[PDB]
DNA sequence: ATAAACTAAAAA
DNA sequence: TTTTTAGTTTATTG
């Protein structure tokens, strides 16, 4: 269930190269290497990372010979990601004065995987190039190259310091040389001929790969899926799988309290007390102590052996139909739960899988939803929620939605504002709003496409929590003596909306500023 | 601890039904408090209770003022309490009612109104006036006079009156009488005219709607930019209700237990003497407790506005957690709800929607949010079912987004589609958001009612949230046949 | 003219 | 591995 | 002081 990667690096002069303002693509992939080995290394992941460099003063690699693989050095081999590697990215790796073939490095890359990943199991197989494409390069043999990466099942990534208006924001939302239009070529033609169409897609720049978790996605482990059935009414019985679609990635690891001088958990000892509530307390007895519930002013003294024997008796697992409504009775407002259910039609079954689809797309046609009983197991509490159509090019599925019962709902009466005299907004207070809304837009529409586009699209950006988390952890781990180094630019330069968004909003922003006054209590 | 009273009118025409199966006003009344009281319990709120009659033979009050019956002085809601109010429920209970206490008798709503407010003596003050009679004293000029003094002398101590006008045989007028009397709001936009009642279910939705004190969840900046700043509260608008949790008490004297969880070291038996500490392989981390907080922190507390996104490129999946509502505070910053008007009057014209970086507490990681603009909406009773904000709904990061299990795309004939269309067509239904009771919570309950009063036999439930096979068995008897015929061959296991 | 190549003996 | 329950902390 | 949210911990089932 473990991925062999290795991460194929340029250090060549080139790499070095930076245009004021502008980070050097060497620093660049530099910070982009880290995201992804930190991420390895913190979250314990199980995977092998070797790290190759190209473009080096010397050549270090078992393919090295005569004139053939020269200026490749094999930093890291295949092995269990560490601190040590890490640090080796931070300060002990530096950029060369050489250059070398690209492709004659994907071979070094490709000669690590082929020769290391004899002894483990490896489910996955994954390379990583990370260059500028401004070196010379031989096309010799390159269709016996693509063939190569298929047959040993290896994927690629591409990672530029180009993507395929305003100032450069590392993370944020003047002319390619004519050495790296005709290495871009070859990148293209190699993509393709491997992924496909959609191949292209898998070359990415530095900048957005920083706000994005594309480094992990061929590498990412497959989503756990569990069987129940879809039943309406009695006689018909539709064969599901379904899996959690959004689910809050939390902290996996905890902060272990201990003792500032010896540094261990052993010595620290949480221990619990009882005493009596009334009037000079007295230490209770902890076998006598009974388990209790209060309704309203009674207090009534109910045990945990009674309990299990009166409490509510769940009827089983099961993902049975209610009934079908409109799609306009079930609104966005009311949707419950901390997770998403994508209901699929159940693997290696076409019976169950045109089943499904006939509820997808007569819910679709209708515009309407069904509204459905879930629980996991028969220990379970009950749900009630939405399961409604989601047709894709590719993929077609119905997706759960918990919705609220009548003791979840909560009731309050809000001031209406529609026609409010004393907060009423003049004619001019209007068109100032109006045009701010217009400058401060998140979405471009072309009209030959006639598409809408966003321009923050912010379920692609990662959860600075992590990164920032591992910053400080790694930080902490190489330099003690040192304080906590401060938030990277580039995260902040990935939250921030993008920089034509806030040099329009300049000019409307101080219009309502002066048009609407504001004052504290 | 607020204090609210229902007060319940006993005359003659309060006992007479519309000549319909309905219920009558005053047997709709006493299920009403009693609905209140049981909801008091599995909502655990604080509130203090009281139940007063007027125009009964049979007087009961602090100063014997005739034809006043205070049944329940002010007090938490009990188990014992709403088995007294059963025994006035439904046509044998009335006749409980008229035997132990009298009806149709002469009253003076300037007494009656004065006991009422006696009752508080021992934060908001409520009274709740169930009645079907919309000119009282009418005959009387005195009596009518005095009682818009008592009414007017309640509303300058700080006592709300609220009317619960029920069905009358030619409708009920405010105009005539009560106009004076209700307890009118300083805002035009703010006061609500409700319809009378002639439901249970329309009643007691009218009486939890005046009765409810609105509960802010955090009052935070809604930033535009560094300088342009307005006051909003975020309300929670849908709350989990879940088992309460558990007293541990004592064997004998069923008295509550103080629990004290003392952290100490194992040699010799301060935070300054702790540190926090993550094993990574051979690497031991070293951190304050200065330090962990340090790097959660972000931003600072409040909305930052990123700037407009249209509501079409909002998926209706990609839901995290409850969606919050967001209206805006002129007590904290004044002009806020003028700027917060605008912006809802152009988001919803304009169709789009505010991203903001939200922040709830102080050293906290931010999350992207859209305030989705909310439209007000009031209901056939008048009754505000959508309020007007903003809707808080919380966006997923990349992280939270799972990779799916990549299929293949099998799609069913169009004969086929269109006999599940007759399925969804003769299945369909009415879904509101009250309509389904979480089985758990309303079997914990009920076995613990069952519990106070000593009852040993507890009253089983039925599970609403189980379909109703036989009814949709009974609406598809040949089209269940016929699709599993079309798209499950006869060698299906 | 373009730079011959010697593959890997595994790729051969 | 997933869900529920209990405990602790922060803000109304 | 009480309520809500988040993080551990425990138990059960596949």
Request: aromatic content about 8%; glycine content about 4%; proline content about 5%.
């Given at each position: 269930?473990?991925?062999?990667?290795?991460?194929?690096?340029?250090?060549?002069?080139?790499?070095?190269?930076?245009?004021?303002?502008?980070?050097?693509?060497?620093?660049?992939?530099?910070?982009?290497?880290?995201?992804?080995?930190?991420?390895?290394?913190?979250?314990?992941?199980?995977?092998?990372?070797?790290?190759?460099?190209?473009?080096?003063?010397?050549?270090?690699?078992?393919?090295?010979?005569?004139?053939?693989?020269?200026?490749?050095?094999?930093?890291?081999?295949?092995?269990?990601?560490?601190?040590?590697?890490?640090?080796?990215?931070?300060?002990?790796?530096?950029?060369?004065?050489?250059?070398?073939?690209?492709?004659?490095?994907?071979?070094?890359?490709?000669?690590?995987?082929?020769?290391?990943?004899?002894?483990?199991?490896?489910?996955?197989?994954?390379?990583?190039?990370?260059?500028?494409?401004?070196?010379?390069?031989?096309?010799?043999?390159?269709?016996?190259?693509?063939?190569?990466?298929?047959?040993?099942?290896?994927?690629?990534?591409?990672?530029?310091?180009?993507?395929?208006?305003?100032?450069?924001?590392?993370?944020?939302?003047?002319?390619?040389?004519?050495?790296?239009?005709?290495?871009?070529?070859?990148?293209?033609?190699?993509?393709?001929?491997?992924?496909?169409?959609?191949?292209?897609?898998?070359?990415?720049?530095?900048?957005?790969?920083?706000?994005?978790?594309?480094?992990?996605?061929?590498?990412?482990?497959?989503?756990?899926?569990?069987?129940?059935?879809?039943?309406?009414?009695?006689?018909?019985?539709?064969?599901?799988?379904?899996?959690?679609?959004?689910?809050?990635?939390?902290?996996?690891?905890?902060?272990?309290?201990?003792?500032?001088?010896?540094?261990?958990?052993?010595?620290?000892?949480?221990?619990?007390?009882?005493?009596?509530?009334?009037?000079?307390?007295?230490?209770?007895?902890?076998?006598?102590?009974?388990?209790?519930?209060?309704?309203?002013?009674?207090?009534?003294?109910?045990?945990?052996?009674?309990?299990?024997?009166?409490?509510?008796?769940?009827?089983?697992?099961?993902?049975?139909?209610?009934?079908?409504?409109?799609?306009?009775?079930?609104?966005?407002?009311?949707?419950?739960?901390?997770?998403?259910?994508?209901?699929?039609?159940?693997?290696?079954?076409?019976?169950?899988?045109?089943?499904?689809?006939?509820?997808?797309?007569?819910?679709?046609?209708?515009?309407?939803?069904?509204?459905?009983?879930?629980?996991?197991?028969?220990?379970?509490?009950?749900?009630?929620?939405?399961?409604?159509?989601?047709?894709?090019?590719?993929?077609?599925?119905?997706?759960?939605?918990?919705?609220?019962?009548?003791?979840?709902?909560?009731?309050?009466?809000?001031?209406?504002?529609?026609?409010?005299?004393?907060?009423?907004?003049?004619?001019?207070?209007?068109?100032?709003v109006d045009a701010l809304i217009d400058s401060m837009s998140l979405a471009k529409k072309d009209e030959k496409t006639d598409t809408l586009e966003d321009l923050f699209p912010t379920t692609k950006i990662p959860?600075?929590?992590?990164?920032?988390?591992?910053?400080?952890?790694?930080?902490?781990?190489?330099?003690?003596?040192?304080?906590?180094?401060?938030?990277?630019?580039?995260?902040?330069?990935?939250?921030?909306?993008?920089?034509?968004?806030?040099?329009?909003?300049?000019?409307?922003?101080?219009?309502?500023?002066?048009?609407?006054?504001?004052?504290?209590? | 601890?607020?204090?609210?009273?229902?007060?319940?009118?006993?005359?003659?025409?309060?006992?007479?039904?519309?000549?319909?199966?309905?219920?009558?006003?005053?047997?709709?009344?006493?299920?009403?408090?009693?609905?209140?009281?049981?909801?008091?319990?599995?909502?655990?709120?604080?509130?203090?209770?009281?139940?007063?009659?007027?125009?009964?033979?049979?007087?009961?009050?602090?100063?014997?003022?005739?034809?006043?019956?205070?049944?329940?002085?002010?007090?938490?809601?009990?188990?014992?309490?709403?088995?007294?109010?059963?025994?006035?429920?439904?046509?044998?209970?009335?006749?409980?009612?008229?035997?132990?206490?009298?009806?149709?008798?002469?009253?003076?709503?300037?007494?009656?109104?004065?006991?009422?407010?006696?009752?508080?003596?021992?934060?908001?003050?409520?009274?709740?006036?169930?009645?079907?009679?919309?000119?009282?004293?009418?005959?009387?000029?005195?009596?009518?006079?005095?009682?818009?003094?008592?009414?007017?002398?309640?509303?300058?101590?700080?006592?709300?009156?609220?009317?619960?006008?029920?069905?009358?045989?030619?409708?009920?007028?405010?105009?005539?009488?009560?106009?004076?009397?209700?307890?009118?709001?300083?805002?035009?936009?703010?006061?609500?005219?409700?319809?009378?009642?002639?439901?249970?279910?329309?009643?007691?939705?009218?009486?939890?709607?005046?009765?409810?004190?609105?509960?802010?969840?955090?009052?935070?900046?809604?930033?535009?930019?560094?300088?342009?700043?307005?006051?909003?509260?975020?309300?929670?608008?849908?709350?989990?209700?879940?088992?309460?949790?558990?007293?541990?008490?004592?064997?004998?004297?069923?008295?509550?237990?103080?629990?004290?969880?003392?952290?100490?070291?194992?040699?010799?038996?301060?935070?300054?003497?702790?540190?926090?500490?993550?094993?990574?392989?051979?690497?031991?981390?070293?951190?304050?407790?200065?330090?962990?907080?340090?790097?959660?922190?972000?931003?600072?507390?409040?909305?930052?506005?990123?700037?407009?996104?249209?509501?079409?490129?909002?998926?209706?999946?990609?839901?995290?957690?409850?969606?919050?509502?967001?209206?805006?505070?002129?007590?904290?910053?004044?002009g806020s709800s003028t700027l917060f008007s605008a912006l809802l009057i152009k988001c919803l014209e304009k169709e789009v929607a505010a991203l903001c970086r939200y922040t709830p507490r102080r050293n906290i990681?931010?999350?992207?949010?859209?305030?989705?603009?909310?439209?007000?909406?009031?209901?056939?009773?008048?009754?505000?079912?959508?309020?007007?904000?903003?809707?808080?709904?919380?966006?997923?990061?990349?992280?939270?987004?799972?990779?799916?299990?990549?299929?293949?795309?099998?799609?069913?004939?169009?004969?086929?589609?269109?006999?599940?269309?007759?399925?969804?067509?003769?299945?369909?239904?009415?879904?509101?958001?009250?309509?389904?009771?979480?089985?758990?919570?309303?079997?914990?309950?009920?076995?613990?009612?069952?519990?106070?009063?000593?009852?040993?036999?507890?009253?089983?439930?039925?599970?609403?949230?189980?379909?109703?096979?036989?009814?949709?068995?009974?609406?598809?008897?040949?089209?269940?046949?016929?699709?599993?015929?079309?798209?499950?061959?006869?060698?299906?296991? | 003219?373009?730079?011959?190549?010697?593959?890997?003996?595994?790729?051969?």
């Open positions: 269930n473990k991925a062999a990667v290795v991460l194929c690096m340029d250090v060549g002069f080139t790499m070095s190269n930076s245009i004021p303002g502008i980070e050097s693509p060497f620093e660049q992939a530099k910070k982009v290497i880290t995201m992804f080995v930190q991420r390895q290394v913190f979250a314990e992941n199980k995977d092998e990372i070797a790290l190759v460099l190209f473009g080096t003063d010397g050549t270090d690699n078992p393919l090295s010979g005569g004139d053939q693989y020269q200026n490749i050095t094999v930093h890291r081999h295949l092995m269990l990601p560490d601190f040590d590697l890490l640090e080796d990215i931070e300060s002990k790796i530096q950029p060369g004065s050489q250059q070398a073939d690209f492709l004659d490095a994907l071979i070094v890359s490709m000669d690590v995987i082929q020769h290391e990943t004899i002894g483990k199991k490896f489910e996955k197989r994954h390379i990583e190039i990370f260059t500028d494409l401004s070196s010379r390069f031989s096309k010799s043999q390159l269709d016996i190259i693509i063939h190569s990466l298929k047959k040993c099942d290896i994927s690629l990534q591409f990672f530029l310091p180009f993507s395929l208006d305003g100032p450069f924001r590392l993370g944020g939302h003047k002319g390619i040389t004519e050495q790296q239009k005709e290495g871009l070529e070859i990148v293209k033609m190699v993509m393709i001929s491997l992924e496909g169409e959609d191949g292209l897609d898998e070359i990415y720049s530095f900048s957005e790969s920083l706000r994005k978790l594309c480094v992990f996605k061929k590498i990412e482990r497959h989503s756990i899926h569990w069987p129940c059935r879809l039943t309406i009414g009695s006689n018909l019985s539709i064969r599901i799988a379904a899996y959690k679609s959004i689910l809050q990635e939390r902290v996996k690891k905890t902060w272990t309290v201990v003792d500032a001088k010896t540094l261990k958990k052993e010595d620290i000892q949480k221990e619990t007390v009882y005493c009596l509530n009334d009037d000079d307390e007295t230490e209770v007895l902890k076998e006598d102590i009974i388990q209790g519930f209060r309704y309203g002013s009674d207090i009534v003294p109910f045990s945990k052996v009674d309990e299990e024997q009166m409490k509510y008796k769940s009827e089983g697992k099961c993902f049975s139909v209610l009934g079908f409504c409109k799609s306009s009775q079930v609104q966005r407002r009311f949707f419950m739960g901390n997770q998403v259910l994508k209901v699929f039609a159940a693997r290696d079954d076409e019976a169950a899988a045109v089943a499904l689809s006939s509820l997808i797309h007569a819910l679709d046609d209708l515009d309407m939803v069904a509204i459905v009983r879930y629980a996991y197991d028969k220990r379970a509490n009950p749900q009630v929620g939405v399961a409604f159509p989601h047709i894709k090019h590719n993929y077609e599925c119905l997706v759960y939605v918990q919705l609220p019962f009548m003791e979840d709902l909560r009731q309050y009466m809000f001031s209406s504002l529609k026609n409010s005299k004393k907060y009423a907004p003049t004619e001019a207070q209007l068109n100032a959860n600075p929590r992590f990164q920032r988390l591992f910053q400080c952890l790694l930080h902490r781990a190489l330099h003690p003596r040192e304080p906590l180094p401060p938030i990277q630019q580039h995260i902040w330069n990935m939250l921030n909306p993008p920089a034509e968004v806030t040099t329009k909003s300049q000019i409307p922003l101080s219009k309502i500023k002066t048009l609407f006054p504001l004052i504290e209590a | 601890r607020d204090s609210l009273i229902f007060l319940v009118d006993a005359s003659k025409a309060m006992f007479e039904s519309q000549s319909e199966d309905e219920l009558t006003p005053f047997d709709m009344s006493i299920q009403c408090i009693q609905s209140v009281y049981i909801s008091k319990i599995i909502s655990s709120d604080r509130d203090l209770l009281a139940v007063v009659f007027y125009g009964t033979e049979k007087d009961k009050n602090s100063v014997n003022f005739k034809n006043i019956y205070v049944l329940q002085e002010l007090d938490n809601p009990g188990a014992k309490r709403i088995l007294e109010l059963d025994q006035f429920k439904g046509q044998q209970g009335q006749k409980r009612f008229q035997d132990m206490m009298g009806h149709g008798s002469d009253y003076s709503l300037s007494e009656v109104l004065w006991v009422c407010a006696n009752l508080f003596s021992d934060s908001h003050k409520r009274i709740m006036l169930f009645t079907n009679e919309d000119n009282p004293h009418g005959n009387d000029s005195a009596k009518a006079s005095r009682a818009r003094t008592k009414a007017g002398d309640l509303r300058d101590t700080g006592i709300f009156l609220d009317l619960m006008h029920l069905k009358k045989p030619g409708g009920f007028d405010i105009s005539l009488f009560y106009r004076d009397i209700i307890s009118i709001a300083e805002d035009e936009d703010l006061r609500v005219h409700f319809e009378e009642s002639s439901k249970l279910e329309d009643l007691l939705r009218k009486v939890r709607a005046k009765e409810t004190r609105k509960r802010a969840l955090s009052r935070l900046k809604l930033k535009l930019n560094k300088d342009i700043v307005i006051s909003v509260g975020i309300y929670n608008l849908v709350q989990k209700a879940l088992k309460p949790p558990p007293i541990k008490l004592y064997r004998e004297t069923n008295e509550p237990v103080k629990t004290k969880t003392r952290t100490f070291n194992t040699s010799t038996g301060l935070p300054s003497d702790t540190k926090r500490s993550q094993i990574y392989g051979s690497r031991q981390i070293i951190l304050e407790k200065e330090e962990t907080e340090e790097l959660k922190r972000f931003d600072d507390p409040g909305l930052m506005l990123m700037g407009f996104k249209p509501l079409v490129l909002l998926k209706k999946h990609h839901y995290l957690r409850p969606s919050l509502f967001v209206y805006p505070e002129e007590s904290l910053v004044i990681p931010p999350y992207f949010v859209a305030l989705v603009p909310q439209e007000e909406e009031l209901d056939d009773q008048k009754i505000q079912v959508t309020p007007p904000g903003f809707q808080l709904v919380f966006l997923p990061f990349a992280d939270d987004k799972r990779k799916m299990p990549f299929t293949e795309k099998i799609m069913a004939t169009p004969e086929q589609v269109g006999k599940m269309k007759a399925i969804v067509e003769k299945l369909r239904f009415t879904y509101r958001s009250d309509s389904f009771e979480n089985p758990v919570l309303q079997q914990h309950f009920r076995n613990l009612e069952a519990l106070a009063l000593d009852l040993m036999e507890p009253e089983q439930a039925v599970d609403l949230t189980l379909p109703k096979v036989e009814a949709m068995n009974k609406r598809l008897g040949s089209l269940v046949d016929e699709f599993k015929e079309l798209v499950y061959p006869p060698d299906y296991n | 003219a373009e730079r011959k190549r010697i593959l890997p003996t595994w790729m051969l």
